[PDB]
């Protein structure tokens, strides 16, 4: 199991997800 | 050792490529949603509507800013805004809260930004074309318009105002 | 030097690198001042004394973007993506062509510099009509870029020549990367060639009265997007094919690396409307199309994130690091050639994330044209690409010159790399945040000090970044000139092979690989995607042109 690679792509997915849902929320506040 | 490691990295890569794709497609669904609701009014009508930037301040709807706000529906206003170096007319744009605003924006000189701080109206203004965008202000007060496209040495100070009346 | 007779391509590659680097240093001088600006501090009166030809923040900004995002990046791409395939194949590039390419770049640069330095082309590196720059900006810029066509030709030549000697062999990894990369670039570039040729050049010489803004932006952005992938892929070739050796490990998968690269060939060009979400006159449906396509183009980097991560893990395990974190400690954090690329990969995480936000059509209305965008792209190009270039200097420079890197120079290198990195991360927090508070990009804000009170906190980050990055640039100048202007030489450094990584064998499927080697076929597909994504819209615009007079407002 490439366990270290998995952590990195976990951190990437959370980064993506936070940025995204973060910005989407803002879009609706300003909507 | 290696042959083991390479199979396992590959097996998990596929997992991740499948998870990533799903994530992306979820975002595609979530964007499609926004497209079906009133908040999508901020997307320009992508209709071409050519005008002459050299006469736009001397004939037609941009040449009289005090008459630029016209009721066009039982609950609809259309506003003919001019973005120019370095300001907007009318100043202020005055509209009622809760009504639908169709902003029709053009420029007599260079490209400007039309970005209404506090809202999702954020549209490029190109000389020779009209930009059409829709918004309903849900809260009275003063919103500031910012130019977000470099337009020359007056860029930093190109501001306008929209007053949404109670 | 007898090394330069055997390998004249070392001298040429050297000249690209150097020119590209000079260009980065001059371009970067403006950086710190711009950071202090987004920090509400006006230090322009100080720049204007040190460099009295600078009439305005905007002329500085033109120089910065053009020098850093156009020139350095291109020279770097042309240095890496010719020379690396050459060495893998162990064959001479057409040297006559290669000097030609360098002179076009050089002369184009000098010629465009003239109106730029004289305040006749303050239009930024996007040069959007009606903003009307001097004819020498358009002509210098056009010859500068066309120089890449000669490079495209050089690599395909090398490629065919090897296939001639070796029918029924797969193209070697680096060479496959460079071929698909150069072919993508050919497609990508036609948007700007068309805009310079039908519109910009004739207009700048007064042969037409106006130019249509809509059609010019549209043609611009056809090239505008894939130019960025054009900046990145050289760093990727290194990260794929060199990084793993430098990490102490190996490339975990040749096929996966070709796959990433193939996908870039297919998806880099048909996505330009993601820069036109806020433009009038383009149907919403097309903007949805391009939005989808852009999320696809994210895939090959999502792919790259896992392959490279796994390669690094493998390296850290080989090197004796146990655990879920222990492989990170076990990596060679003393080697600047390892550290720079890896750090750029670090920040590429949030940068990629910002990117995905930008792609999402309606979400772009939140961030379009705010400090957010510069925050996004400093992670991508100012950090990951530039850092990759910088770091690689520690192997590339001895490989090409024969000069040794001393330990002291290594350490200076670490410091620069780290400071540059940290500065970029700090500034990315300032700009993203600022962008969320509706602060515009491309503005001399310090000059309207009371406009954005709400941004006081993120501004302090921009100031802090300003200083950190001043320090790292000063360190980078001082370090770069030690190595380059050093008395000693050592030619067996210039002969020791490039540190190319070894792959791990486990059968891949040879069929996937063979399928990916159908390069003409994939090029066709890529060409068709552009026609389907641009054609309908360009047909509708070209049938309704509205040229408008040009302005000079600087
Ligand atoms: C090199 C240069 C650039 C790249 C690459 C880049 C990538 C993206 N961008 Fe972009 N961006 C946009 C879309 C994205 C998309 C979807 C991506 C994607 O390709 C990103 C995908 C990447 C990822 C999903 C991240 C994967 C991360 C990796 C690979 C990290 C691995 C970590 C490891 C391995 C570490 C492990 C090691 C340890 C020790 C732990 C759009 C819109 O859709 C806009 C316009 C917005 C607007 O309003 O104008 C835009 C505008 C810009 C600007 C401004 C243009 C201007 O002047 O107006 C520039 C120059 C630029 C640069 C670049 N852009 N972009
Ligand atoms: C010493 C580090 C440097 C600093 C502190 C830094 C800072 C900045 C800031 C503050 C701006 C935004 C200015 C504005 O929108 O008004 C900017 C814009 C820019 N920078 Fe940098 N920069 C650095 C290095 C580079 C690097 C290496 C690249 C290219 C590889 C580069 C590419 C760009 C581009 C293309 C723009 C946009 C200019 C435009 O909107 O026309 N930066 N930089
Ligand atoms: C290095 C890994 C990248 C992690 C940085 C991503 C930033 C995430 C959230 C900031 C939002 C705060 C609210
Ligand atoms: C490395 C650089 C990292 C850059 C940092 C940017 C990080 C995350 C963006 C997330 C967007 C943040 C959105 C928070 C606001 C929110 O959630 O919105 C509700 C509010 O009512 C609306 O007005
Ligand atoms: C984010 C999660 C992405 C990682 C997805 C993990 C997928 C699981 C997987 O692919 O597991 C195969 C392996 O052979 C098991 O035996
Ligand atoms: C196992 C497979 C199942 C995986 C499914 C993933 C679910 C994710 C997103 C669903 C999309 C939800 C769409 C609803 C959006 C509503 C919204 O956000 O409303 C905004 C606003 O308040 C009104 O105008
Ligand atoms: C680390 C990152 C930290 C992220 C902080 C993001 C903050 C705000 C975005 C929210 C925007 C919501 C827009 C509402 C603005 C508004 O109400 O203002 C105008 C109006 O005039 C009133 O009458
Ligand atoms: C002005 C162009 C000078 C060209 C010099 C060059 O690179 O060409 C080599 C030439 O044959 C001389 O050695
Ligand atoms: C080869 C070198 C130079 C080409 C010469 C090009 C010179 C053409 C000069 C045209 C010119 O400057 O016309 C400006 C006019 O005011 C409209 O903008
Ligand atoms: C380059 C060839 C010059 C074409 C210029 C031309 O024919 O101009 C058309 C004009 O705009 C209409 O009167
Ligand atoms: C490969 C992907 C190709 C196909 C992907 C999806 C395209 C389908 C429909 C777009 C609908 C968009 C219409 C939005 C108009 C919103 C509006 O009316 O603006 C006010
Ligand atoms: C916002 C501003 C803050 C920005 C910081 C973001 C992350 C910081 C550093 C990333 C580097 C991660 C890995 C560092 C590893 C060094 C290591 O493990 O060293 C081993 C030891 O030296 C034997 O070599
Ligand atoms: C919290 C305060 C805000 C940050 C202040 C900014 C920079 C401090 C300078 C840091 C310089 C980092 C040097 C690390 C270095 O050179 O590390 C070699 C190392 O052993 C592995 O590669
Ligand atoms: C050893 C070296 C480490 C030192 C690095 C510090 C680490 C991070 C903290 C602060 C730096 C802030 C510097 C910013 C300088 C002035 C900010 C400013 O202009 O203040 C505006 C004020 O909010 C409106 O009145
Ligand atoms: C290389 C790393 C360089 C790290 C630089 C840190 C900047 C200084 C921080 C100390 C605080 C000084 C701020 C005191 C004056 C603030 C002020 O007066 O603002 C104008
Ligand atoms: Cu008008 Cu910037
Ligand atoms: O260009 O993103
Ligand atoms: Cu793009």
Short mmCIF file of N, CA and C in Angstrom, two decimals, chain C residues 105-214:
data_model
loop_
_atom_site.label_atom_id
_atom_site.label_comp_id
_atom_site.label_asym_id
_atom_site.label_seq_id
_atom_site.Cartn_x
_atom_site.Cartn_y
_atom_site.Cartn_z
N UNK C 105 14.38 34.47 -30.90
CA UNK C 105 14.14 34.80 -29.49
C UNK C 105 14.88 36.09 -29.08
N UNK C 106 16.22 36.09 -29.17
CA UNK C 106 17.02 37.27 -28.83
C UNK C 106 16.58 38.58 -29.51
N UNK C 107 16.49 38.57 -30.85
CA UNK C 107 16.14 39.78 -31.63
C UNK C 107 14.72 40.23 -31.33
N UNK C 108 13.76 39.31 -31.40
CA UNK C 108 12.41 39.59 -30.92
C UNK C 108 12.34 40.26 -29.53
N UNK C 109 13.06 39.69 -28.56
CA UNK C 109 13.21 40.31 -27.24
C UNK C 109 13.73 41.74 -27.30
N UNK C 110 14.91 41.92 -27.88
CA UNK C 110 15.50 43.26 -27.97
C UNK C 110 14.53 44.25 -28.60
N UNK C 111 13.90 43.86 -29.73
CA UNK C 111 12.98 44.73 -30.48
C UNK C 111 11.72 45.11 -29.67
N UNK C 112 11.16 44.15 -28.95
CA UNK C 112 10.00 44.40 -28.08
C UNK C 112 10.38 45.22 -26.84
N UNK C 113 11.60 45.01 -26.33
CA UNK C 113 12.13 45.79 -25.21
C UNK C 113 12.12 47.27 -25.52
N UNK C 114 12.43 47.64 -26.77
CA UNK C 114 12.54 49.06 -27.12
C UNK C 114 11.31 49.92 -26.80
N UNK C 115 10.16 49.64 -27.39
CA UNK C 115 8.93 50.37 -27.00
C UNK C 115 8.52 50.10 -25.54
N UNK C 116 8.85 48.92 -25.01
CA UNK C 116 8.50 48.62 -23.64
C UNK C 116 9.22 49.53 -22.68
N UNK C 117 10.52 49.72 -22.90
CA UNK C 117 11.36 50.51 -22.00
C UNK C 117 11.07 51.99 -22.17
N UNK C 118 10.43 52.34 -23.27
CA UNK C 118 10.24 53.75 -23.66
C UNK C 118 8.84 54.23 -23.32
N UNK C 119 8.04 53.35 -22.71
CA UNK C 119 6.65 53.65 -22.33
C UNK C 119 5.69 53.74 -23.49
N UNK C 120 5.92 52.95 -24.55
CA UNK C 120 5.08 52.94 -25.74
C UNK C 120 4.22 51.67 -25.87
N UNK C 121 4.27 50.83 -24.85
CA UNK C 121 3.59 49.53 -24.90
C UNK C 121 3.13 49.08 -23.49
N UNK C 122 2.65 50.04 -22.71
CA UNK C 122 2.12 49.77 -21.42
C UNK C 122 0.69 49.22 -21.59
N UNK C 123 0.58 47.94 -21.90
CA UNK C 123 -0.72 47.31 -22.24
C UNK C 123 -0.91 45.97 -21.47
N UNK C 124 0.09 45.68 -20.62
CA UNK C 124 0.29 44.40 -19.97
C UNK C 124 0.55 43.23 -20.98
N UNK C 125 0.99 42.09 -20.43
CA UNK C 125 1.35 40.92 -21.21
C UNK C 125 0.12 40.29 -21.88
N UNK C 126 -1.07 40.86 -21.67
CA UNK C 126 -2.28 40.38 -22.40
C UNK C 126 -2.64 41.30 -23.57
N UNK C 127 -2.14 42.53 -23.52
CA UNK C 127 -2.24 43.46 -24.63
C UNK C 127 -3.60 43.40 -25.30
N UNK C 128 -4.66 43.67 -24.53
CA UNK C 128 -6.04 43.63 -25.06
C UNK C 128 -6.40 44.88 -25.80
N UNK C 129 -6.77 44.77 -27.07
CA UNK C 129 -7.38 45.90 -27.80
C UNK C 129 -8.66 46.34 -27.04
N UNK C 130 -9.05 47.63 -27.10
CA UNK C 130 -8.41 48.70 -27.88
C UNK C 130 -7.09 49.32 -27.42
N UNK C 131 -6.49 48.79 -26.37
CA UNK C 131 -5.26 49.37 -25.85
C UNK C 131 -4.26 49.13 -26.96
N UNK C 132 -3.62 50.20 -27.46
CA UNK C 132 -2.87 50.14 -28.71
C UNK C 132 -1.38 50.38 -28.53
N UNK C 133 -0.59 49.32 -28.51
CA UNK C 133 0.81 49.44 -28.17
C UNK C 133 1.58 49.71 -29.45
N UNK C 134 2.83 50.11 -29.28
CA UNK C 134 3.71 50.35 -30.41
C UNK C 134 3.91 49.12 -31.30
N UNK C 135 3.92 49.32 -32.64
CA UNK C 135 4.21 48.21 -33.60
C UNK C 135 5.47 47.35 -33.30
N UNK C 136 6.48 47.91 -32.64
CA UNK C 136 7.65 47.11 -32.27
C UNK C 136 7.39 46.13 -31.12
N UNK C 137 6.39 46.42 -30.28
CA UNK C 137 5.97 45.42 -29.26
C UNK C 137 5.37 44.20 -29.95
N UNK C 138 4.35 44.39 -30.79
CA UNK C 138 3.75 43.30 -31.59
C UNK C 138 4.71 42.55 -32.50
N UNK C 139 5.67 43.25 -33.09
CA UNK C 139 6.55 42.60 -34.06
C UNK C 139 7.65 41.79 -33.36
N UNK C 140 8.32 42.42 -32.38
CA UNK C 140 9.25 41.73 -31.47
C UNK C 140 8.61 40.54 -30.78
N UNK C 141 7.43 40.73 -30.20
CA UNK C 141 6.74 39.63 -29.53
C UNK C 141 6.43 38.46 -30.50
N UNK C 142 6.01 38.79 -31.74
CA UNK C 142 5.62 37.78 -32.73
C UNK C 142 6.80 36.95 -33.21
N UNK C 143 7.96 37.59 -33.35
CA UNK C 143 9.14 36.93 -33.87
C UNK C 143 9.67 36.09 -32.68
N UNK C 144 9.43 36.58 -31.46
CA UNK C 144 9.97 35.95 -30.28
C UNK C 144 9.28 34.63 -30.11
N UNK C 145 7.98 34.66 -30.25
CA UNK C 145 7.16 33.47 -30.06
C UNK C 145 7.38 32.52 -31.24
N UNK C 146 7.35 33.03 -32.48
CA UNK C 146 7.54 32.17 -33.69
C UNK C 146 8.80 31.27 -33.57
N UNK C 147 9.83 31.81 -32.95
CA UNK C 147 11.02 31.04 -32.55
C UNK C 147 10.75 29.63 -32.01
N UNK C 148 9.61 29.44 -31.35
CA UNK C 148 9.18 28.12 -30.90
C UNK C 148 8.85 27.15 -32.05
N UNK C 149 8.53 27.68 -33.23
CA UNK C 149 8.19 26.83 -34.40
C UNK C 149 9.43 26.11 -34.90
N UNK C 150 10.51 26.86 -35.01
CA UNK C 150 11.82 26.28 -35.24
C UNK C 150 12.19 25.19 -34.19
N UNK C 151 11.88 25.43 -32.90
CA UNK C 151 12.08 24.37 -31.90
C UNK C 151 11.19 23.13 -32.18
N UNK C 152 9.90 23.37 -32.41
CA UNK C 152 8.99 22.29 -32.80
C UNK C 152 9.64 21.49 -33.92
N UNK C 153 10.15 22.18 -34.92
CA UNK C 153 10.73 21.48 -36.06
C UNK C 153 11.96 20.63 -35.64
N UNK C 154 12.87 21.26 -34.88
CA UNK C 154 14.06 20.57 -34.35
C UNK C 154 13.72 19.25 -33.62
N UNK C 155 12.69 19.25 -32.80
CA UNK C 155 12.41 18.03 -32.04
C UNK C 155 11.77 16.95 -32.90
N UNK C 156 10.77 17.30 -33.69
CA UNK C 156 10.20 16.34 -34.67
C UNK C 156 11.26 15.75 -35.60
N UNK C 157 12.25 16.56 -36.01
CA UNK C 157 13.38 16.09 -36.81
C UNK C 157 14.13 14.99 -36.07
N UNK C 158 14.74 15.34 -34.94
CA UNK C 158 15.27 14.34 -33.99
C UNK C 158 14.39 13.09 -33.85
N UNK C 159 13.09 13.29 -33.65
CA UNK C 159 12.16 12.17 -33.47
C UNK C 159 12.08 11.24 -34.67
N UNK C 160 11.83 11.82 -35.85
CA UNK C 160 11.65 11.03 -37.04
C UNK C 160 12.96 10.30 -37.29
N UNK C 161 14.09 11.01 -37.21
CA UNK C 161 15.42 10.41 -37.41
C UNK C 161 15.67 9.13 -36.56
N UNK C 162 15.21 9.15 -35.32
CA UNK C 162 15.35 8.00 -34.48
C UNK C 162 14.39 6.92 -34.88
N UNK C 163 13.15 7.28 -35.23
CA UNK C 163 12.19 6.29 -35.71
C UNK C 163 12.70 5.65 -37.02
N UNK C 164 13.37 6.45 -37.85
CA UNK C 164 14.02 5.94 -39.08
C UNK C 164 15.01 4.83 -38.74
N UNK C 165 15.91 5.09 -37.78
CA UNK C 165 16.88 4.08 -37.32
C UNK C 165 16.27 2.94 -36.52
N UNK C 166 15.02 3.09 -36.10
CA UNK C 166 14.42 2.16 -35.14
C UNK C 166 12.94 1.95 -35.32
N UNK C 167 12.52 1.50 -36.51
CA UNK C 167 11.09 1.21 -36.73
C UNK C 167 10.67 0.19 -35.70
N UNK C 168 9.40 0.13 -35.41
CA UNK C 168 8.92 -0.87 -34.48
C UNK C 168 9.53 -0.84 -33.08
N UNK C 169 10.23 0.24 -32.73
CA UNK C 169 10.44 0.62 -31.32
C UNK C 169 9.52 1.79 -30.86
N UNK C 170 9.05 1.73 -29.60
CA UNK C 170 8.35 2.87 -28.97
C UNK C 170 9.29 4.09 -28.78
N UNK C 171 8.72 5.28 -28.88
CA UNK C 171 9.49 6.47 -28.69
C UNK C 171 9.91 6.38 -27.23
N UNK C 172 11.18 6.65 -26.94
CA UNK C 172 11.64 6.78 -25.52
C UNK C 172 10.85 7.86 -24.74
N UNK C 173 10.59 7.61 -23.45
CA UNK C 173 9.84 8.55 -22.56
C UNK C 173 10.02 10.11 -22.71
N UNK C 174 11.23 10.62 -22.47
CA UNK C 174 11.47 12.06 -22.58
C UNK C 174 11.06 12.55 -23.97
N UNK C 175 11.55 11.87 -25.00
CA UNK C 175 11.27 12.24 -26.40
C UNK C 175 9.78 12.26 -26.74
N UNK C 176 9.05 11.21 -26.29
CA UNK C 176 7.58 11.19 -26.33
C UNK C 176 6.95 12.41 -25.64
N UNK C 177 7.44 12.74 -24.45
CA UNK C 177 6.98 13.94 -23.76
C UNK C 177 7.17 15.17 -24.63
N UNK C 178 8.39 15.36 -25.11
CA UNK C 178 8.75 16.56 -25.85
C UNK C 178 7.98 16.67 -27.18
N UNK C 179 7.78 15.53 -27.86
CA UNK C 179 7.01 15.49 -29.14
C UNK C 179 5.56 15.93 -28.89
N UNK C 180 4.84 15.19 -28.05
CA UNK C 180 3.48 15.60 -27.70
C UNK C 180 3.37 17.04 -27.18
N UNK C 181 4.43 17.52 -26.51
CA UNK C 181 4.48 18.87 -25.92
C UNK C 181 4.61 19.91 -27.05
N UNK C 182 5.54 19.67 -27.94
CA UNK C 182 5.75 20.55 -29.09
C UNK C 182 4.59 20.59 -30.06
N UNK C 183 3.97 19.43 -30.28
CA UNK C 183 2.79 19.36 -31.13
C UNK C 183 1.59 20.07 -30.50
N UNK C 184 1.40 19.87 -29.20
CA UNK C 184 0.37 20.64 -28.47
C UNK C 184 0.66 22.14 -28.66
N UNK C 185 1.92 22.54 -28.49
CA UNK C 185 2.23 23.94 -28.60
C UNK C 185 1.90 24.52 -29.95
N UNK C 186 2.16 23.73 -31.02
CA UNK C 186 1.82 24.17 -32.39
C UNK C 186 0.31 24.52 -32.52
N UNK C 187 -0.56 23.56 -32.25
CA UNK C 187 -1.98 23.83 -32.11
C UNK C 187 -2.30 25.08 -31.30
N UNK C 188 -1.85 25.06 -30.04
CA UNK C 188 -2.15 26.10 -29.08
C UNK C 188 -1.85 27.49 -29.62
N UNK C 189 -0.63 27.63 -30.20
CA UNK C 189 -0.11 28.93 -30.67
C UNK C 189 -0.83 29.62 -31.84
N UNK C 190 -1.62 28.88 -32.61
CA UNK C 190 -2.23 29.44 -33.83
C UNK C 190 -3.23 30.53 -33.53
N UNK C 191 -3.84 30.47 -32.34
CA UNK C 191 -4.76 31.51 -31.88
C UNK C 191 -4.11 32.87 -31.82
N UNK C 192 -2.90 32.93 -31.25
CA UNK C 192 -2.15 34.20 -31.16
C UNK C 192 -1.48 34.64 -32.52
N UNK C 193 -1.01 33.65 -33.30
CA UNK C 193 -0.48 33.91 -34.62
C UNK C 193 -1.60 34.56 -35.46
N UNK C 194 -2.76 33.92 -35.51
CA UNK C 194 -3.95 34.54 -36.13
C UNK C 194 -4.28 35.95 -35.64
N UNK C 195 -4.21 36.20 -34.33
CA UNK C 195 -4.49 37.54 -33.79
C UNK C 195 -3.37 38.54 -34.15
N UNK C 196 -2.11 38.11 -34.10
CA UNK C 196 -1.03 39.03 -34.50
C UNK C 196 -1.14 39.29 -36.00
N UNK C 197 -1.48 38.27 -36.78
CA UNK C 197 -1.43 38.38 -38.24
C UNK C 197 -2.63 39.10 -38.85
N UNK C 198 -3.84 38.71 -38.50
CA UNK C 198 -5.03 39.37 -39.07
C UNK C 198 -5.39 40.67 -38.40
N UNK C 199 -4.84 40.93 -37.23
CA UNK C 199 -5.36 42.04 -36.42
C UNK C 199 -4.30 42.94 -35.82
N UNK C 200 -3.49 42.42 -34.90
CA UNK C 200 -2.50 43.26 -34.22
C UNK C 200 -1.45 43.96 -35.06
N UNK C 201 -0.75 43.20 -35.91
CA UNK C 201 0.30 43.78 -36.78
C UNK C 201 -0.25 44.85 -37.73
N UNK C 202 -1.25 44.53 -38.57
CA UNK C 202 -1.88 45.55 -39.48
C UNK C 202 -2.38 46.83 -38.79
N UNK C 203 -3.01 46.64 -37.63
CA UNK C 203 -3.49 47.73 -36.78
C UNK C 203 -2.37 48.54 -36.21
N UNK C 204 -1.34 47.89 -35.69
CA UNK C 204 -0.19 48.65 -35.17
C UNK C 204 0.62 49.38 -36.23
N UNK C 205 0.47 49.00 -37.49
CA UNK C 205 1.08 49.77 -38.58
C UNK C 205 0.08 50.70 -39.25
N UNK C 206 -1.14 50.74 -38.75
CA UNK C 206 -2.12 51.67 -39.29
C UNK C 206 -2.81 51.22 -40.58
N UNK C 207 -2.78 49.92 -40.86
CA UNK C 207 -3.37 49.41 -42.06
C UNK C 207 -4.85 49.14 -41.86
N UNK C 208 -5.29 49.07 -40.61
CA UNK C 208 -6.73 49.01 -40.31
C UNK C 208 -7.04 50.02 -39.24
N UNK C 209 -8.30 50.46 -39.20
CA UNK C 209 -8.72 51.52 -38.29
C UNK C 209 -8.88 50.96 -36.87
N UNK C 210 -9.60 49.86 -36.76
CA UNK C 210 -9.79 49.26 -35.49
C UNK C 210 -9.58 47.78 -35.38
N UNK C 211 -9.87 47.25 -34.19
CA UNK C 211 -9.88 45.85 -33.95
C UNK C 211 -11.07 45.55 -33.06
N UNK C 212 -11.73 44.43 -33.36
CA UNK C 212 -12.80 43.91 -32.54
C UNK C 212 -12.23 43.25 -31.22
N UNK C 213 -12.58 43.83 -30.07
CA UNK C 213 -12.15 43.34 -28.77
C UNK C 213 -12.52 41.90 -28.52
N UNK C 214 -13.78 41.55 -28.80
CA UNK C 214 -14.31 40.20 -28.58
C UNK C 214 -13.53 39.14 -29.33
#
